Structure 1
Amino acid sequence: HMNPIVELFIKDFTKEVMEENAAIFAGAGLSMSVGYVSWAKLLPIAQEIGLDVNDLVSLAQYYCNENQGNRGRINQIILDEFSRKVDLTENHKILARLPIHTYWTTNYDRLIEKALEEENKIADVKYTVKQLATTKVKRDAVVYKMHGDVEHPSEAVLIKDDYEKYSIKMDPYIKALSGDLVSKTFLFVGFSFTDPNLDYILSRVRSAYERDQRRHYCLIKKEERRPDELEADFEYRVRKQELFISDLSRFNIKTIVLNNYNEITEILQRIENNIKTKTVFLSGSAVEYHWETEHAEQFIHQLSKELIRKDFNIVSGFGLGVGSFVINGVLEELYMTIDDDRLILRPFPQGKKGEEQWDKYRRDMITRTGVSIFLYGNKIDKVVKAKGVQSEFNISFEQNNYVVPVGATGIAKDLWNKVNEEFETYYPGADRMKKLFGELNALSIEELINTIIEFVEILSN
C-alpha cells in the first residue's frame, strides 16, 4: 500500500522486532499528538519573565549557579509546561503491545512506562546512575531515561552542559547506549532537526564513516511549504532537514521521510499486524464430522503441521475432537524439545469453578493471537452444535482478530455464512482474497490446507 521505501523498512524492522532484539529511541515528538515539538516556542516562558531572547547569558549563569535551588526551580517550570503539553498516543500503545524490550528516551514524561503497565507489562525504569546496577524481577522491558524523570525535577538534564559537568552520572548511560547501538537495531522517532540534544548524543555514541556498523532507522516528516512565507525560508528548512538526514546517514542511521506524522502510526500498526498474524488460535471441537473420522483427524493433523512448517504459532483450547490431533500434527514437525513459542495449550478446567471463569480463560488464550481459524464445532449433549466455538468467534472479533472459518467443516459453516454475507464488515478489501475465502466452504486435504494457509498468509500484508 505505502511507498516501496516504507514497505522495505516495515519488512526489515518487522524481522528485527520479531526476533525480540529491537530497540526504540524516543524523542519529545512522540509525546505530542501533533508528532513534534517546537523547541523554541516551548521554551513564551522567558517572555513571561520579561527576559527576551544578552538576557540568555544571565539565564544560563543563573541556572548554572552554585545554589542548586535555581536549577530546581527552572527545571520545575519547564518540566511543568512539558507535562501540561503531553499526552498518550496510539503509538505508545502499539509499541507497548510489540515484543520490544529496550526503550531509550530523553523524555521526562512517563508515557512509555505507563503504556507498558496498561498492557500488564513490567517496566524497569532507569533514570539514575545507581538504577543501572539493579535488575527488576520479571521485567518485560527496560526504559532508559537519560535526561532524568519528571518526578525528580532537580536531577533532570535539560542542557548538554550536564554531560560536561557531571560525566560520572551521564557516562554509564552513554556506555550502555553505545553498546546497545552496536547490538540492537534501533528505531529513532520523535526527533526533528531542531532537537537540541540528539546530534551531541549520537556524536558521543557513534563513529562517523565507520564501516560495517549496524543499520538503524529514523522516521521523520517531510518539510512542507507554509502559506505566508518566503520560498527561501522553505528551502532553508529543507536544507536543514537534508543536513540532519546526512548527519544521521554518517552514523549508518537510515532516515525515512513520511508525508505526515500519522503515517508513523500506520507503519506501527502494520508492524503489529505482521507480528500478531503469526500466532494462530485454533478453535473447534467435534464428535461428528462428511469425511471419515481418521481422515479428518489427518486433516487437522497436517493443518497443524503445515501451520508449524510455515513458522506459525498455535494456541489451542484443546477441544475434544480437535486438540489431540493438533498436538500430533505439531509434534510430527517438532520432534524431528517443544519450543514454548510454537504451541500453547489451554485445556478448559471442568466443574463449576472452572466454568465460572471459562470466559476470562478464553479471552486470555485468544489475546495471544491475531488470527482465529474455526473448525467444526459440535459436541455430545443429547449431537449438538458447540456454542463455545461461536463464543470464541465473538471474542475473536471484539479483539480485532482476522476471522477464518472453514465452512467445509460445517458451527464453522454457520459463521462462514454470517461472514460471507455482509462481508465488508470483516475484511474491508478484495485482494485472490475474496475467492480464497469462498473456497473454504469439499476439496482434498492438501488443497484445503493450502487454501487456509495461503489465506492466512495473504492476511499478513
Structure 2
Amino acid sequence: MKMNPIVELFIKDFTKEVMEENAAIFAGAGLSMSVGYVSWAKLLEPIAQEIGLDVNKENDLVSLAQYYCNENQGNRGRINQIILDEFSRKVDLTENHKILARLPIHTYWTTAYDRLIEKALEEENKIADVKYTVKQLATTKVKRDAVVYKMHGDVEHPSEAVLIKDDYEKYSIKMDPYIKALSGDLVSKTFLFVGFSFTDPNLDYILSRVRSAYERDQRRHYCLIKKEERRPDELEADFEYRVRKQELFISDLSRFNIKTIVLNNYNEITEILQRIENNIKTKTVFLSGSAVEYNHWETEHAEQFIHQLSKELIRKDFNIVSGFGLGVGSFVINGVLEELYMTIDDDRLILRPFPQGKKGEEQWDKYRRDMITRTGVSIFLYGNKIDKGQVVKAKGVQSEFNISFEQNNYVVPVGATGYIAKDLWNKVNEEFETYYPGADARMKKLFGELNNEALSIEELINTIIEFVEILSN
C-alpha cells in the first residue's frame, strides 16, 4: 500500500536527490541498535555502578564516562575494553544496511563504532573507503563507490573513540578536518539523518556553525524520528508532556532546516527505504520480445506500436535496456533515437545484442542475467521466432520472464501482442497475488486491459505507461 502524504513527499524528494548522487546518509547509533548490539547505557551500567552511580537515574552518559575516568586518574582502559568487546561482535546485518548499500549513495557519516556499514557495502561488491583518522582524509581509495566518515572513531581503535567529555572538548582541535568536511557536506549534499537523536554536542556545534554561516539559506536536510509511544505503566498527562516535548524538539530541529519525518514504528524505516529503492530500481525497464509475426496487427502497424511505446517510455524519463531481439530491438532503437534526437546518454538506451554463434550461446545465459539485473521492470511483447521454416514460440522470452521473476522484478506481459506474451499474461493472471502482491482495483483493471486485443496502438501504449507508472510510484 502507501503511507502518509508527508512521507510520500519525502520519498519523492529523496529519490530525486539520490538519483543525482547528491544525497548522503548520517547514521547514528540507533541504526545499529536493531542489529543486536546492547545500548550504550547498558554498556555503561557496570561502570556507573563502579563509581557509585546508576545509569537508569542518569541522563548524560558522556558525563558518566567522564566521572569514571576522573576516578581512575584519567584512565580509559575499562571503557576501551568494553567498547572493543561489545562492538566487535559477529552479528548479522539488518535490512536497512543492505538497502543503503544497494542505493547509489556515495557518502556516509556515522557516529557508531561498529563496522556494519562497511560490511553492508562490501557485501554488495562495492568498494568502500572508511575514514576515521585525520591522516586518512588525505588519501582516497581508487574507484571507491562510497566513503564512510566515522566521525567518532572505529571499534578496532577504542582509544580514539569519542566516549568521554574530554574527547568532545578536544574534538574541535584534534579532529578539526572532520568538522570542516562535515560542514562542507552539510551545505553541498542533502542528508538523511537515520537513527540519530540530535543530542550529540559535536553535531550541535557543527549545525550551529552552519546556521550562523548561512542563516536562512541553509540546504534542506531530512530526518527520521519515531514518535513517542506510551510506556506500559505511565499516566496520560506525562505521555502528553513527552509528546509535546518531542514536538518542540522536532520544531527546533527545523531551525537548522532539517525536516523531520514522524515514524510510527521503527520498522517503518525499512518500508521507507524499500520505497526509495523501488522508485530508483524500477526507473529502468527491460523491453523483452522477438517477433516474426505480429498477431492481429500488420508488420508496419506493430512496428509503429513498438516505436511509439519506446518513444513514450523514454519521454517519461525511463531507461530502456534491450537485448536487440529480432523484431522489437530495431524498433525500440528507432523510438529511442527519435525521442532523444528531438548524442545518446549511456543511461537512457542500453543495447546488449546477443552474440550469434555456438561460442556465444554458452555465455547467453549469464549475458541475459546481467542485462536483466540492470533493470527493475520487465515488459514482454510477442515472443515468436522462425524455426524449421515455421513460426515457433521463442523460449528466450520465457527465459527472460523467469530470470526477471527470480529477481523480484515487476513483470508486465503485454497479452495483446499475443504468442508467448499471451501465455505469460495468462500465467500471471492465474495467480495474481504471486506476481503483484497487494494490488488495487486500478492495477487489476490495467492488467486485464493488457489483454484487450481490441485496443488501438495509442490506447494500449497508454495502458502500459500507466501500469509502469503506478508500479514505479
TM-score (norm 1): 0.91
Give, in angstroms, the shift of residue 235 of structure 1.
4.5
Specify which of 208, 215, 221 is matched with residue 210 of structure 1: 215
> In 2 relative to 1, CA 59–305 (structure 1 residues): closer, same or farther, beyond 3 Å?
closer
> In 2 relative to 1, CA 66–318 (structure 1 residues): closer, same or farther, beyond 3 Å?
farther
Equivalences for residues 254-265 of structure 1 within 5 A: 254-265=259-270
**C-alpha contact 1:286 1:376 (8 A) present in aligned 2:** yes
Cα distance in structure 1, aligned partners of 2:92 and 2:163: 20
Specify which of 441, 444, 464 is matched with residue 434 of structure 1: 444
> In 2 relative to 1, CA 334–56 (structure 1 residues): closer, same or farther, beyond 3 Å?
closer
Say which SS state the counterpart of residue 101 (structure 2) adopts. helix
Say which SS state the counterpart of residue 47 (structure 1) adopts. helix
Say which SS state the counterpart of residue 412 (structure 2) adopts. strand
Give, in angstroms, the shift of residue 70 of structure 1.
3.7
> In 2 relative to 1, CA 393–68 (structure 1 residues): closer, same or farther, beyond 3 Å?
farther
- What is the aligned partner in structure 2 of residue 401 from structure 1? 409
Cα distance in structure 2, aligned partners of 1:147 and 1:205: 19
Cα distance in structure 1, aligned partners of 2:386 and 2:32: 54
> In 2 relative to 1, CA 127–433 (structure 1 residues): closer, same or farther, beyond 3 Å?
same
Give, in angstroms, the shift of residue 350 of structure 1.
3.0
**C-alpha contact 2:35 2:94 (8 A) present in aligned 1:** no
- What is the aligned partner in structure 1 of residue 30 from structure 2? 29
Cα distance in structure 1, aligned partners of 2:315 and 2:293: 28
Deviates more, 1:368-377 or 1:233-242: 233-242
Cα distance in structure 2, aligned partners of 1:369 and 1:324: 19
> In 2 relative to 1, CA 168–353 (structure 1 residues): closer, same or farther, beyond 3 Å?
farther
Deviates more, 1:437-446 or 1:361-370: 437-446
Say which SS state the counterpart of residue 201 (structure 2) adopts. coil
> In 2 relative to 1, CA 176–356 (structure 1 residues): closer, same or farther, beyond 3 Å?
same
- What is the aligned partner in structure 2 of residue 72 from structure 1? 77
Cα distance in structure 2, aligned partners of 1:346 and 1:45: 61
Q: Deviations over 1:150-206 (max 9, x none)?
A: 222222222453243254441111111111111111110111366675434433544
Deviates more, 1:328-337 or 1:62-71: 62-71
**C-alpha contact 2:35 2:92 (8 A) present in aligned 1:** no
Give, in angstroms, the shift of residue 242 of structure 1.
3.2
> In 2 relative to 1, CA 337–160 (structure 1 residues): closer, same or farther, beyond 3 Å?
farther
> In 2 relative to 1, CA 68–269 (structure 1 residues): closer, same or farther, beyond 3 Å?
farther
Coordinate RMSD, CA, aligned? 3.1
**C-alpha contact 1:278 1:370 (8 A) present in aligned 2:** yes
**C-alpha contact 2:65 2:165 (8 A) present in aligned 1:** no
**C-alpha contact 1:128 1:169 (8 A) present in aligned 2:** no
Specify which of 318, 323, 327 is matched with residue 317 of structure 1: 323
**C-alpha contact 2:41 2:61 (8 A) present in aligned 1:** no
Say which SS state the counterpart of residue 51 (structure 1) adopts. coil
Give, in angstroms, the shift of residue 456 of structure 1.
0.6
**C-alpha contact 1:29 1:36 (8 A) present in aligned 2:** no
Q: Deviations over 1:401-422 (max 9, x none)?
A: 1110111111111100111122
Give, in angstroms, the shift of residue 443 of structure 1.
2.2
Cα distance in structure 2, aligned partners of 1:193 and 1:233: 22
Give, in angstroms, the shift of residue 425 of structure 1.
1.5
**C-alpha contact 2:23 2:105 (8 A) present in aligned 1:** yes
**Is 1:46 paired with 2:52?**
no
**C-alpha contact 2:250 2:260 (8 A) present in aligned 1:** yes
Identity %: 100
Give, in angstroms, the shift of residue 304 of structure 1.
0.8
Aligned length: 460
Say which SS state the counterpart of residue 64 (structure 1) adopts. helix
Deviates more, 1:311-320 or 1:158-167: 158-167
Equivalences for residues 229-248 of structure 1 within 5 A: 229-231=234-236, 233-235=238-240, 237-248=242-253
Say which SS state the counterpart of residue 370 (structure 2) adopts. helix
Give, in angstroms, the shift of residue 60 of structure 1.
5.2
Cα distance in structure 2, aligned partners of 1:97 and 1:58: 38
Q: Deviations over 1:67-125 (max 9, x none)?
A: 99943552231242234496521111111111111111111111112112222221121
**C-alpha contact 2:84 2:156 (8 A) present in aligned 1:** no
Say which SS state the counterpart of residue 357 (structure 1) adopts. helix
Deviates more, 1:51-60 or 1:432-441: 51-60
Cα distance in structure 2, aligned partners of 1:66 and 1:170: 26
> In 2 relative to 1, CA 228–62 (structure 1 residues): closer, same or farther, beyond 3 Å?
closer
Give, in angstroms, the shift of residue 42 of structure 1.
3.6
Give, in angstroms, the shift of residue 41 of structure 1.
3.1
**C-alpha contact 1:277 1:371 (8 A) present in aligned 2:** yes
Give, in angstroms, the shift of residue 267 of structure 1.
0.9
Say which SS state the counterpart of residue 375 (structure 1) adopts. strand
> In 2 relative to 1, CA 422–172 (structure 1 residues): closer, same or farther, beyond 3 Å?
same
TM-score (norm 2): 0.88
Give, in angstroms, the shift of residue 389 of structure 1.
0.9
Structure 2: stretches of 5+ with no match in the other structure: none
- What is the aligned partner in structure 2 of residue 348 from structure 1? 354
